[PDB]
Amino acid sequence: MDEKSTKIIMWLKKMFGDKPLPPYEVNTRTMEILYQLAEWNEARDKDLSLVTEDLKLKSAEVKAEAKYLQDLLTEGLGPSYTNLSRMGNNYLNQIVDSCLALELKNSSLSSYIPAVNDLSSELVAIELNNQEMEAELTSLRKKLTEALVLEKSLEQDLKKAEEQCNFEKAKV
Amino acid sequence: KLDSHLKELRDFMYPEGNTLMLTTPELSGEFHQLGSQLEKLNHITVEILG
Amino acid sequence: EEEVKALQKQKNLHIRRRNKLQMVESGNRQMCLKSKDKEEETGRAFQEVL
Amino acid sequence: MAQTLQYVSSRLSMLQIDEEDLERNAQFGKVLIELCPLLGPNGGSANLNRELEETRRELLLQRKMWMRSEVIYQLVQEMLLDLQVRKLEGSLTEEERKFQDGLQQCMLVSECSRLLTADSVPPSDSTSILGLDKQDLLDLLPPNMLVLWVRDRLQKQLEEALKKKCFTFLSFHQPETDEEGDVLRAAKVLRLASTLEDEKRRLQNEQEKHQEMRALLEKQQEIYPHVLLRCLSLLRQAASELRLRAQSDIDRI
Amino acid sequence: SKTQRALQKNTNPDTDALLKSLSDHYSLELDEMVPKMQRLIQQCEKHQEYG
Hints:
The structure is cut from a larger assembly and holds 1 copy of chain A (172 residues), 2 copies of chain B (50 residues), 1 copy of chain D (253 residues) and 1 copy of chain E (51 residues).
Chain B: H1 2-13, H2 25-49
Chain D: H1 2-11, H2 19-24, H3 26-35, H4 46-88, H5 94-116, H6 134-138, H7 144-173, H8 182-252
Helix pairs in contact in D: 4-5, 4-7, 5-7, 7-8
Chain E: H1 2-10, H2 15-50
Function (chain B): Contributes to mitotic spindle assembly, maintenance of centrosome integrity and completion of cytokinesis as part of the HAUS augmin-like complex.
Subunit structure (chain B): Component of the HAUS augmin-like complex. The complex interacts with the gamma-tubulin ring complex and this interaction is required for spindle assembly.
Protein name (chain B): HAUS augmin-like complex subunit 3
């Protein structure tokens, strides 16, 4: 028990920082819930720290590749590729923003086509699962309500039956 | 299983659906009929003694 | 009935998208056959340079 | 108490907290409410979640810059492929053929120039591949008049190809737009990115609704067997104590 | 596991054993008690004639 308690007090000090720890009822159940929360938060914070440091690396690599492509296009095509019309630049922005929304590798039709299909299929599959689950939840609520009404009827009929049986016992 | 056991025990305890059956209906009828016949026999006995 | 309508709409969408994918794929396959002839032409030009 | 439970379960959906746990431990309930802003909705620390969202925004900015150049490069590749297929069909004009060969040569020379250039190494010590310098490749470039003409003609073809690629994207997402005129298609292209971003947000909201309904279903599945057991207990008492015993003894006497 | 522990606390008697006890009791009243009452009814009727 003492190791879990020390881990919780350490974790709570780390989370609250300089704020005074609020008093709470220290029992087996509250310490178990706090212990699970502390383990889950430590695991999640490790995973988040690894993702954040990879995103920093990826931001530097993508910036390096962006510069390479810009300079390649400037050497090959000249400064002409940046001088698009207001509509040419709007079409360019919509391809870019569509590919960013879908988190694509690149702007190819081979990347765009599957991503639009997967998004459409996941949306309908989750909407269907939500309708099925809302029907189960409505059905189970009806059964639960009928069972609660039955519980109340049985309580009353049992009490009437006990009163009637006590009256007939006295007559017997 | 809980729904089945609840339904079977309820159907046995509530054969007319609405009333808790404490006494066998056949036996309840015979009690009423014997009660009535014994009340008639008591009347005849009181009349003859009078 | 809304679910049947939604699935009919999704079926019609998949039929249209598959037809489009088959058009893209048929155009691409014709481009790829000609790009193989191009790979043989550039392979010949590469042998000429060798 | 129910509002406190609902707030904590919405933010800490991994915590099994019962209403009895908060009723017996009212100060513990305050600690969980104070932890809910220090913990993100994902169970990770709120500071680490802000740093994650800042690092995501920076990546998204660099990715947007990369994607603008990538789209143009891939359009030039796709255009060169389409012109090269039409050249094998014999369906190119002499002018398109000069443009395709001039554009392909300008791109190949610039790509190969970048394979030779260690731009940052002082020129005395860098062994070049095949002993070739950037100057040896510049001689394989088309005549300067042809390069300028390719660059001027390219700007129009790049806008036409951008319009075509946007129209392909729209027509795969919304295949009903193929029967629509170019002006209506252009107006729908201008909303395509926002429509995909709204569809993705709708997916996230329905996944959250799914988790919330699943948690409510599981709570009702826990309560329902206990209600049935209480009803069975009352019926067993009526059967065993009243019918088989108390009423049976009354009827005998 | 909470539900199984609640089922184990409520199970003396078992539901099938209780239904059988209820059916056996119902049969005993029909075979023994009902024909005893009918004999007492017929005896009361004979005693009314003897009046």
